[PDB]
């Protein structure tokens, strides 16, 4: 019935066949589920299905930390029957920029410590921007043909980070098996 | 038979498939069921069906607290048979604005303390505005084709807050299991 | 057979599905069954069917107490077979205005004390104006197609008030279970 | 179902029938999986299928190390049924340039030592550039006809290198049997 899971997993599959990429479920905050954001805890009910909570993560702006690929198209159908008309835009971001962000000093008092400690979800971040400013409508059959605004994201990446009390570290080997001591 | 539950749950489902969002039942006060408002107590008769009472919550205006996405469309049908022609407008509101509202001092003498104590419904608030200034008519079959004025809301969010005698606190982890000591 | 109950309950149902709202039976005094008015005692013969008596309630005018939504339309049919062509006008009235009316001093010698004591109906008032200045004719089948003048009301609300000998109080939690000691 | 494996292995087969060449799985970073890059560890699940991680390897630029074939076409189909419309560009790079790169001094502090030691994947490099600036769409049947942006790579080569603590050496005899002591 649902269409966004189908579209995001089509992106993920043709993006790399059953690989590293992760899809998103909610567009309550999809476009603002950009880099420096979170995701709900993972459960296995009705297949691989997690929760959704992706609040902000920018901490400081003292050193250069906010400095700034062509259009891509997916116009096909899947035999229920689905029809996808996606267009994708890519803003290249450097990988050593991730190291720079790790070097950035972690210091905030945003009301996020309470929820983060209560969850212990060991939040992870994206690697490189995946953006869509595409058209509205897609199609699905069980009819219900969904509609999508421009400037929205579909799939995201993993870079595990650990948060001690004051300053953080990194776990880059795609660690999302929910095991930590924080 | 009823159409508004169908329309709001269609919004909720295609908004995120059976997820966090909550629909509304009454348009007695729908547009004025904006942020800073309430909802009736939850019961399980005829499925998930709650009551409806969403009175005002603005308390003080001393610091900046009243400062101020493109159009979205849903034009489909569901196989009874229903037909939806919804248009949606979005006014972006910041998430740290919720923290600012929590920091706002709670002080009122509005005749709401009596009803709030008699109910103990642990009221919860919305996250980001969901507005519709769309057309009038929709369609349904058992015929009865409903009509909807502009500048109205359909679905809302959760941010639990606890009210001690003088000043309040927050319960952000989507807590709506009606358990408190106030 | 009767049509006004059908029309008012259609208003109530699509107004909120089997919820707080209350319909009216008689148009002997419908338009003047505005705010500050009464209703007959409730009985359970032939379903939920009450009496009708809604006389005046204005008491004093010393402080500001008489200071002063767009058009709505319902153009459908119900499968007997009924056909409704209602238009509705709304004059917004504040909720803290109800608190102001409660603060208003109660003092009258209108010949209403005798009937009120003989009835003990614990009269209740409306919340916000519901007005119709719509067209005349509707349709019904068992034919008999009813006609309705402009500037008339269909459904009303509840705000229970208790009347001691001199000054009154409030019972806001939609209390209409006919229990009091006055 | 998957199409990129088919296309890359078609390249590999007609490039040399079941020979030295290696195909890639992910286009998360395909174009930037150029020379001086990595690959995920090799496993044998669902046939020959490895992981994917190809981060950067440039170390120093002091001596000449960044100084700088006609178009090729593959327009056929394979009897499921597939249809390929590939165009290929080649930028010739010298083989003694590989010796020069080996002579280049290895010295970096990029956050890659941790992941490299944790993996022990004994990374290997390409021999000569294989580039495609071709059209978008291909075709496949189980329909799903994939799309490909210009300036992207499909297949790559092997030149094993060993990394001691400070300075590296070479293992040129196409050694990718994951055996080392580093």
Numbering used by the authors:
A (entry chain J), B (entry chain K), C (entry chain L), D (entry chain I): 2 to 69, 81 to 91, 112 to 174, 194 to 233
Per the authors:
We thus subjected GSDMB isoform 1 to cryo-EM analysis. The GSDMB pore was found to be 24–26-fold symmetric. 3D refinement of the 24-fold symmetric pore led to a final map at 4.96 Å overall resolution whereas focus refinement improved local resolution of the globular domain to 4.48 Å, allowing us to build an atomic model of the GSDMB pore using the structure of GSDMB in the complex of GSDMB/IpaH7.8 as a starting model. The interaction in the adjacent globular domains contains mostly residues from helix α3 of one subunit interacting with the region around α2 and β11 of its neighbouring subunit; and the α1 helix from one subunit juxtaposing end-on with the α1 helix from the next subunit through hydrogen-bonding and hydrophobic interactions. Previous studies have identified the N-terminal α1 helix (‘thumb’, binding site 1 (BS1)), the β1–β2 loop with a hydrophobic tip flanked by positively charged residues (‘wrist’, binding site 2 (BS2)) in the GSDM globular domain and a positively charged lipid-binding site (binding site 3 (BS3)) present on the membrane-inserted β7–β8 hairpin as structural elements for lipid binding. As expected, all three binding sites are conserved in GSDMB. BS1 and BS2 contain basic residues of R10 and K14 in the α1 helix and K43, R44 and R50 in the β1–β2 loop interacting with the acidic lipid head groups, and hydrophobic residues of F46 and F47 in the β1–β2 loop hydrophobic tip inserting into the lipid bilayer as a membrane anchor, whereas BS3 is mediated by basic residues of R174 and R195 in β7 and β8. Surprisingly, the density of the region 2 in GSDMB pore is also visible, regardless of the relatively lower resolution. However, only one basic residue (R229) is structurally conserved in the GSDMB isoform 1 pore. Due to a four-amino-acid (222AGLD225) insertion in the interdomain linker, the residue at the first position (P1) is replaced by a negatively charged D225. Substitution by an acidic residue at this position probably weakens membrane attachment by repelling the acidic membrane surface, thus attenuating the pore-forming activity of GSDMB isoform 1.
